[PDB]
Amino acid sequence: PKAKTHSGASKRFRRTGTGKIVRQKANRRHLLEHKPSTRTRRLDGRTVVAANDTKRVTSLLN
Amino acid sequence: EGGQMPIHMRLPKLKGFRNRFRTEYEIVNVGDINRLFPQGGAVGVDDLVAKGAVRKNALVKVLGDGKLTAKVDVSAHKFSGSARAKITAAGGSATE
Amino acid sequence: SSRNGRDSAAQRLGVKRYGGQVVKAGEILVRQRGTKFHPGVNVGRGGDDTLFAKTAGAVEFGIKRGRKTVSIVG
Amino acid sequence: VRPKITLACEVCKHRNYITKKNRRNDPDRLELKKFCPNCGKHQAHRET
RNA sequence: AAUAUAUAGGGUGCGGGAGGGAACGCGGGGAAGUGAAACAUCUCAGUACCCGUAGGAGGAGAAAACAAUUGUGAUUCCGCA
RNA sequence: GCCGCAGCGAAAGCGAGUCUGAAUAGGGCGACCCACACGCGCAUACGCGCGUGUGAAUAGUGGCGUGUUCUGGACCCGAA
RNA sequence: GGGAUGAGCUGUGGGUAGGGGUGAAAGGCCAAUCAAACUCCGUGAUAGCUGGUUCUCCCCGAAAUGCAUUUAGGUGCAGC
RNA sequence: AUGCCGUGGUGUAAAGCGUGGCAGUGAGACGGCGGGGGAUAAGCUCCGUACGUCGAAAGGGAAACAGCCCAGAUCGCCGGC
RNA sequence: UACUAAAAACACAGGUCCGUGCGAAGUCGCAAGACGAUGUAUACGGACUGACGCCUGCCCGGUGCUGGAAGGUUAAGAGG
RNA sequence: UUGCACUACGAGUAAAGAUGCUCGUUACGCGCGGCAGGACGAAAAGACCCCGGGACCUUCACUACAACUUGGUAUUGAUGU
RNA sequence: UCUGAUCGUAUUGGGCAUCUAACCUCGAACCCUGAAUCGGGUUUAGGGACAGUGCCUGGCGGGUAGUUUAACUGGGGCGGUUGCCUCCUAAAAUGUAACGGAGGCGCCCAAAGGUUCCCUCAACCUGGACGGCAAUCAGGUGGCGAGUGUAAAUGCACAAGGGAGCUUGACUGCGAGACUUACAAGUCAAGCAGGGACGAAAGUCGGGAUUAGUGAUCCGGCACCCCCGAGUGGAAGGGGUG
Numbered sequence A: 001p002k003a004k005t006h007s008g009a010s011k012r013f014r015r016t017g018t019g020k021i022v023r024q025k026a027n028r029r030h031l032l033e034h035k036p037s038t039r040t041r042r043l044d045g046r047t048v049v050a051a052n053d054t055k056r057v058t059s060l061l062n
Numbered sequence B: 001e002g003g004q005m006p007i008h009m010r011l012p013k014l015k016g017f018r019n020r021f022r023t024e025y026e027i028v029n030v031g032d033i034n035r036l037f038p039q040g041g042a043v044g045v046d047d048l049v050a051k052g053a054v055r056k057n058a059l060v061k062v063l064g065d066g067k068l069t070a071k072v073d074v075s076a077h078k079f080s081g082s083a084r085a086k087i088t089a090a091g092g093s094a095t096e
Numbered sequence C: 001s002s003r004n005g006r007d008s009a010a011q012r013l014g015v016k017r018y019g020g021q022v023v024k025a026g027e028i029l030v031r032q033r034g035t036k037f038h039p040g041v042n043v044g045r046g047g048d049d050t051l052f053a054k055t056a057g058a059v060e061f062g063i064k065r066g067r068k069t070v071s072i073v074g
Numbered sequence D: 001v002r003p004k005i006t007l008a009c010e011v012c013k014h015r016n017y018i019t020k021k022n023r024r025n026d027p028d029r030l031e032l033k034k035f036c037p038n039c040g041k042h043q044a045h046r047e048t
Numbered sequence E: 001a002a003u004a005u006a007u008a009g010g011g012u013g014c015g016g017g018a019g020g021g022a023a024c025g026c027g028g029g030g031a032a033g034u035g036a037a038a039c040a041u042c043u044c045a046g047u048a049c050c051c052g053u054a055g056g057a058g059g060a061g062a063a064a065a066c067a068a069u070u071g072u073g074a075u076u077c078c079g080c081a
Numbered sequence F: 001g002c003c004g005c006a007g008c009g010a011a012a013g014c015g016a017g018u019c020u021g022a023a024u025a026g027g028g029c030g031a032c033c034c035a036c037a038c039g040c041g042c043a044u045a046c047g048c049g050c051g052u053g054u055g056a057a058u059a060g061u062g063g064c065g066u067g068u069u070c071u072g073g074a075c076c077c078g079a080a
Numbered sequence G: 001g002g003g004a005u006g007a008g009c010u011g012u013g014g015g016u017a018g019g020g021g022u023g024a025a026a027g028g029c030c031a032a033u034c035a036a037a038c039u040c041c042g043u044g045a046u047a048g049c050u051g052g053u054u055c056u057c058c059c060c061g062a063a064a065u066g067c068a069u070u071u072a073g074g075u076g077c078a079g080c
Numbered sequence H: 001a002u003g004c005c006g007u008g009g010u011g012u013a014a015a016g017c018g019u020g021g022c023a024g025u026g027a028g029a030c031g032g033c034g035g036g037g038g039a040u041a042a043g044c045u046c047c048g049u050a051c052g053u054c055g056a057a058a059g060g061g062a063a064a065c066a067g068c069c070c071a072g073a074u075c076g077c078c079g080g081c
Numbered sequence I: 001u002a003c004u005a006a007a008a009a010c011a012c013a014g015g016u017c018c019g020u021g022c023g024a025a026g027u028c029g030c031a032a033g034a035c036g037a038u039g040u041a042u043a044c045g046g047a048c049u050g051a052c053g054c055c056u057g058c059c060c061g062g063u064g065c066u067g068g069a070a071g072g073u074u075a076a077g078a079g080g
Numbered sequence J: 001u002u003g004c005a006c007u008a009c010g011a012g013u014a015a016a017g018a019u020g021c022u023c024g025u026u027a028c029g030c031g032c033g034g035c036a037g038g039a040c041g042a043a044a045a046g047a048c049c050c051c052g053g054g055a056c057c058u059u060c061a062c063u064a065c066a067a068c069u070u071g072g073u074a075u076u077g078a079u080g081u
Numbered sequence K: 001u002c003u004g005a006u007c008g009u010a011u012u013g014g015g016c017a018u019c020u021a022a023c024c025u026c027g028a029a030c031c032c033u034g035a036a037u038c039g040g041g042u043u044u045a046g047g048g049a050c051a052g053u054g055c056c057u058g059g060c061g062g063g064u065a066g067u068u069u070a071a072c073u074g075g076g077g078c079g080g081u082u083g084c085c086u087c088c089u090a091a092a093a094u095g096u097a098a099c100g101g102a103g104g105c106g107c108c109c110a111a112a113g114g115u116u117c118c119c120u121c122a123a124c125c126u127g128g129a130c131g132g133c134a135a136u137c138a139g140g141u142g143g144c145g146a147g148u149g150u151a152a153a154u155g156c157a158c159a160a161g162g163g164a165g166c167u168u169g170a171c172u173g174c175g176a177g178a179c180u181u182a183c184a185a186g187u188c189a190a191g192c193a194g195g196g197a198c199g200a201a202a203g204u205c206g207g208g209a210u211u212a213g214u215g216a217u218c219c220g221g222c223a224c225c226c227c228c229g230a231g232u233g234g235a236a237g238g239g240g241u242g
Ligand SMILES: *C(=O)[C@H](CCSC)NC=O
Pocket: J048
């Protein structure tokens, strides 16, 4: 049969134009009063999946 | 991962929705109009398919990366902003 | 039975760049609690007394009236 | 005893900031001059 | 017939049904082991099994259909999407 | 029909750019050969931008082998 | 050794069926098997557990540590 | 004292680092040295050690004797140290 | 307790309590139907005690079971 | 039942209880009849303990269903007050 | 014809009582029936819009069914413990185990924050109405033995300790470069622009001397921005940013 992909990893990861894999950062959905703006700006945006998780994340997206 | 909450449940979901009604545009640069059509002429949506620069049965869109020195008369959907500037500088026109 | 057994994490304090070592601008030099070292030329303190670098150069240590200091020779 | 109050503006009523006060030392609503990004300048802020 | 109109019932005469068959079809009832590193939602699966009923095939089939300002024009089936 | 051919953005959309933002500020992601004389407002010298090339090095996709992997009993044997 | 005219023993024929029967009650008995029979089917049930896995040679060659874990004889990632 | 971090020399093939394919291991053992728990008991237990050997290392020595001492087996020889 | 336990264990005649007014209560069945019983509270089903003799004290707060409905709380339907 | 076989004993040693290793000491080769100290004798992939799985049993563990039970509406109507 | 009262008619509900015709009867008789303690039909004697049953709905429910019931542990159970912060063990970088040794935390502060200026403490000694070892005063001596909202360590007298003035930076948009790190996270940050506070200026300010005072994802809630809007215009829903 045909290879299914993981519905959780497709909603948490995506690919850029050169094949990098990006994600969003945690600790930002709630409990935001005591977190200063130096912390919510560090946790804002996207970063690249680290080089030690890039093999399991690639074989969940595909 | 052995019992801890995995990498596909620790991280938050990517934000947003997907537009169900999104209209895509296949893409030709204006520097490929120069190389494929070095003498210019009528450049339609059908002549860009056969010369191998855009796909079949899709809405086209002419963008503006390159150097256009040919005098072309290009007909396509949804021209760009820097593309109309380079086509009319070479004496051409750009209709929808 | 015992009432002991809990400790905290290790905070990895100490001198992170030694003397003569060429640093970049912004590098954390001496992470610590309190002012065990004091900031000198081209070294700013930091919130938890972290003693970073303000300009690229070489770290050198010295004494400035009893308080031992970290400086950067540009 | 220290709830989380939120500070609404006095011109646009946007809820720009969130912080904590003591309910029994400060029974009334706090008033601070804080920067409002909609107005682009420092306005007044009561609580809600 | 009881009982009156009559019916239930009984007499007689011609047709028909019944049960079997390896698979396939349609309609109805419907598991658990299992997977979820436990488990109940969920999965396994409308699977296994059972019930009714066929035919040489069966079911569906002639728009109270899609589509999106143009249009396609009964159903089934195979390939994509 | 699929993969390649342009990316960025939650999206509208814009497009060698784009998102954020008050910003011709900074970042994110993406694009971009100066090994090359020459010509240019270059010059104590390397460069800057653009031509001319000396004609620089990209590239994918389909098949068939192999190593792992996915769904199936999935290396084989065994419960209560 | 106990009962031996009794709540006796016995023959022939019959009835009760599997979360059910029957039991002067022992979880006893239901075809030498019973804290839920037997046979076929789901079915090649599953097992973080034990056992096994077959011809040759040449080069290099570990680990038994860290962190997380309904985790501690298992596993993910790093270390080698 | 050592150890550690940077730097300038000199030496050294099979060192290092970045990125891909396939792993195994995650029960360790005794001995030297520094310690905790134990009675400064254990072939006990739990840590440190660019420390060693076994694990996965045959040979010579310690009578025998995984872990101590010497030394790391490509093959052949009725040579030598 | 067939096949390591025959007993002080079960049964028992007698006792008390509770249920049952009659296609009864109870049980077997989705139901029809059946047993109870071709019986009718001196009868039938359940629970505990266990011949006989003398006796069987105090406690209704807790948890049941039976009766009650003044008050509070409380579903679908109606209202909209 | 069975890896072998021209299968001694002592003091040692070793995975800490040796026919099989060290150093000794003892013993001609093969049968037959007896005794049961050893071969950690045979028989049963320990019933105890522990770790993982199962079954069945209990309740004021959780979540469900049958049985019993309450109300509305349908079957279901008429007239007084 | 508004507020309140009372009377009457009509149309609708809820009580109670009566009726019979639905429905009910294992009360009785008769026929099908030759043989019938079955069944059905006719008639009669009763019950009666109740009961029973369908659908919806609360209750009750070990009668029955599926399951769960953690780990570390000098065997297991019993007792204790599990995350965070500081010290010692820890062998003069960093890190390091044990059911090894001691202690803290699940907050507090609208000033105990920001800034500008000013001051030096504790203890001891001498004199003084109530007044004592010790309240407030005065003078000598005193370089840190006091103090730090809160445990410990490292800091702090240049003060980060004490006091006063004005205040909200307990900011919005960012961030070159680092620490730590399996990963998830954690932590520090020069400097640039906006609009501000204090200061004559220089400058300092993205809470508190520093390190504890906390909880990933999912699913939701609210405020605002007006991005998508299942033919179209809206809306429902979804999306972003706090
Ligand atoms: C315990 O010793 C006992 C005997 C086991 S046989 C060594 N357990 C159960 O009977």
